[PDB]
Every structure is written in C-alpha cells, then in structure tokens.
Structure 1
Amino acid sequence: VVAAAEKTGVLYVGSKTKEGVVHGVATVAEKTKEQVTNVGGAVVTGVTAVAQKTVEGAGSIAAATGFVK
C-alpha cells in the first residue's frame, strides 16, 4: 500500500485500505425481554458492532462450544 507523486494545479494521490471495519450503525431497542437457562453448556447472545482482524491465527466471533473431553 504505497503512494508516490512527482511534479516538475491540484494533484491528489491516495491509497486507502480497510479490513474488518464496522461503522454507521444506529440501534434502538424497546422492552426487549430475554431469559437464558444453561446447565453445563455454552450460550452466546447479544453481539452487536464487533470487528476483528486476525493474522496467523484462528479468529472466532460469538462462538459457543460444548464440553470437550
């Protein structure tokens, strides 16, 4: 991601890059009711506006896994 310019008037040079970006989010909630009952497991809920960038690794978002033996 480089940007070079030479001159020998308006000159514009740009190089933009986005990875894993969340923006411009508007949320309205009213009288939302939730009830979770877990017995020896895994429950994931209520995930909003989450951004993640992972390099040379495993990336999990809102991941629920049962018991491992």
Structure 2
Amino acid sequence: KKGVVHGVATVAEKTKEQVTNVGGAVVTGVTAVAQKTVEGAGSIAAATGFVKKDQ
C-alpha cells in the first residue's frame, strides 16, 4: 500500500476508536465528576483535558 499525508491524518484498519483533532476539544470517554463546593478566584477545580494559552 501507499500513503502520503500532510497532517494531521489518522489512518488505520480494524480499529475500535479514532480521534483526530486540531483545535479545540474532543471528549469521547466516560467521565464522572461529583463535587460539593468550589470557591476561590480563580481555581481550576477538576480539569481532565485542558489547555490555557491566554495572551
């Protein structure tokens, strides 16, 4: 076989899960957050996949 990509690719066979991202956010997984009190200014309480590039 032959393949040429510029990116971003994701090429496969017999594949149970696939995610391609440029951005941006993708949530595909099981996630449970239980929480009782959030205070403070300002605290990232429960972050799973996170990116902060403030300018």
Task: Give the TM-score normalised by the residue count of structure 2.
Answer: 0.31
Percent identity over the alignment is: 96
- Decide which structure has greater strand share: 1
- Runs (4+) of structure 1 exceeding 3 A deviation are 18-32, 55-69
1:13-65 CA distance string (max 9 Å, x none): xxxxx999999999999999211000111112212443222344799999999
Larger Rg: 1
Q: Can you give the 5+ residue segments of structure 2 that lack an aligned partner in the other structure?
A: none
Residue correspondences, number:
52
Please give the alpha-carbon distance, in whole angstroms, between the structure 1 residues aligned to 2:4 and 2:35.
8
- Bigger relative contact order, structure 1 or 2 (CA pairs below 8 A, ≥6 apart): 1
Moved more, 43-52 or 29-38: 29-38
Question: Could you state the TM-score of these two structures normalised by the residue count of structure 1?
Answer: 0.27
